[PDB]
Amino acid sequence: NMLLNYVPVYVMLPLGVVNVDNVFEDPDGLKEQLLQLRAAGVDGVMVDVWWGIIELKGPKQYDWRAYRSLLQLVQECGLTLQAIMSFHQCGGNVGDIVNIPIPQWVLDIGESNHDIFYTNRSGTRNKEYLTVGVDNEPIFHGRTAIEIYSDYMKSFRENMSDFLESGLIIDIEVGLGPAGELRYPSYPQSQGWEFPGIGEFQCYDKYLKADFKAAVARAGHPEWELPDDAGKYNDVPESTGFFKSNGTYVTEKGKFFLTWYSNKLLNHGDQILDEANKAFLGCKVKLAIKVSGIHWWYKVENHAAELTAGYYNLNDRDGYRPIARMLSRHHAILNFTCLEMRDSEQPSDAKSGPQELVQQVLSGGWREDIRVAGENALPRYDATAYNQIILNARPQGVNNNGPPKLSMFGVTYLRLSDDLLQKSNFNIFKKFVLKMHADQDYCANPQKYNHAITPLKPSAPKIPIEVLLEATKPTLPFPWLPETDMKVDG
Template sequence: MEIFISPHTVVQILIPLPKWVTEEIEKDPDLAYTDQWGRRNYEYLSLGCDTLPVLKGRTPVQCYADFMRAFRDNFKHLLGDTIVEIQVGMGPAGELRYPSYPEANGTWKFPGIGAFQCFDKYMLSSLKAAAEAAGKPEWGSTGPTDAGHYNNWPEDTPFFKKEGGGWNTPYGEFFLTWYSQMLLDHGERILSSATSIFDGAGVKISVKVAGIHWHYGTRSHAPELTAGYYNTRYRDGYLPIAQMLARHGAVFNFTCIEMRDHEQPQDALCAPEKLVKQVALATGAAQVPLAGENALPRYDEYAHEQILQASSLNVDGSPVDREMCAFTYLRMNPSLFHPDNWRRFVAFVKKMKEGKGARRCWEEVEREAEQFVHVTQPFIQEAAVALMH
């Protein structure tokens, strides 16, 4: 198993859309994702204009491809050696999803259900065409307007409530199928470009999928639906994503691997363990590699043990010899290099490296790790100081 450590600085780094793209959005605000109240989101361009020449005569997908091609040409001497995997951004925070739960300016707060992002003219044009093709033109004028606000809970809304909710009606099925398919189609387009551009470069291509575990225990799974994952109590929304990635030989990268159900707010019916299990089964069925990462900064053995358990993919229905292909540990900061945290982390990495076949106890592994901790102490102290500046 490959283990990556991701750095985290005290100041949050925001990488916005290029200035020349925001200038085009100023000319045509509908290039940005839009909610039903007209609020625009500038984290990523609307999927509705994926194939339209709205960026100075080029489509967004063509621009994404040009960027990937430039990256390949400038870093070709590092590909396959120093750079062994390229995670292709598919949306906000690099994840394949809609920006349905924006934290900026306090718009959304955990565990709100989020909001649909399909009210720009390009998305509405696609919805209109889909409704006409389905013989229901009356369904194509707008997205759901009874799905509540960003910080509502499912039962607060007519659309997401468990009894008689619009999500579980013919209209709801039509809308959610279209909404999620737009996301899948976007993934197909970007991956088609990525796999073509990096073919033969010796790198894996991976895609990050968000771990939306809150309200997972409800029937509608509202936060997943607004993010574009058509996953409900009656429908598997992760298998189509896994199958799409499998068609392009990409890695399915998933988060919240360190979480346990009981650690999260139970009134919000959070279930990260059940969600990870569902994703493990979906990726197993699609025969696509699964990689993971933790969502929160954790340095305790309890979290490490959960990561080990989740990465072993010991779930009913999964192949016995299967495990996660890689794990990214978040985050590299001064806390990680605290003596006790570092000692636990070294033992954790050693255990991860040994894989699911190892059956040794933590104490034995930690004793072996002591020597490494002692040898690396001067470097660790130096790293901790550096990260504080």
């Protein structure tokens, strides 16, 4: 049956649907929009559950009222929900039309200890997320950053138990960094970064610096220092000593640093996911993390932008599969956030390979046998974008004799806006949804298309870093069709 080729479609809700004062502003307005989505066949929606709004008053001072009202409305409208545990700030990244800081009480601590923030070589502190450096530092009124994230998720589970039991929530996206993605904030618009700048390493806070220094001493090179020749945000790789041909990134020192730098993220995600699994143990939901799509400089040997973001990916070292393997012990979904771009849409001097990057990441996931999902990075309403998303959702097309050998677990569209509901735009969107569903009508019961959700099981045993890094071995991607067999047209 064709229904087995069905890929669910989700739509992100507007940023700030519940304001910074913890008020669900316009229920009636959202309702009309939600009803529009329901009639269009959309399976569900995605929303940020902002840590800065909910635990604003103080440690463990949670107020879930506004969000309960939102979830209630989503349920009445017949849609499922992907809830994001948003432990980051809204405001400094692309598309952020509203400012939502992390808890003020945490910010207060940052006033006396600026090292709780990601810091660049020049000393600028980025306040959008707590540095992985303090994950296990008990400096937040007795709690460590990970304990804060853990308590938050447990309180969410307990206070939203009725919604979880009714099966409203499809998956829990655990924010792991800027924009909720597992990465370092290497390309901060707030600091003047501009596409396609290579970005900057963000390992200069006192905690990471101390860890690095101890690490190199144990490796037998206590004299090694953090990179000092990687240039600045808007540089080009060839103009730096670190990323140029035969540069520092290829030396024993550079390789050690890069491994250390990227390993911190793997451990960051792995440990917080352990907490997320405990908090939702037994609940009928799945866990997911977000991986940023850094396609610029992907076509040159140095992969500069990826390296500064924490993805140690080169042509002879897969920096993404290790993440997928890490996710398998948690039975988690890898949500890749850049799925709609084509190489020809990027200026040529940016050396962008979004299409090749996608193929590498998705293949890695299916290779490791984990579920892969995705989102479009930028607002798009044209058929070319939709056709590209549909192509990546089912790389080898539909199978009339059963399930496709390869398919994504789901796609979340960014974002719900009045522009989307405009007659013509919404018309095309409806076709996109239809094709994602493989020409089948909306299907209410996920079990029909082999997406039944069972109670979350405890994570499998910890996988040692060495076994994880074995996944760096380059593999050939699965074959992609040149264009989808389920085009939207027009």
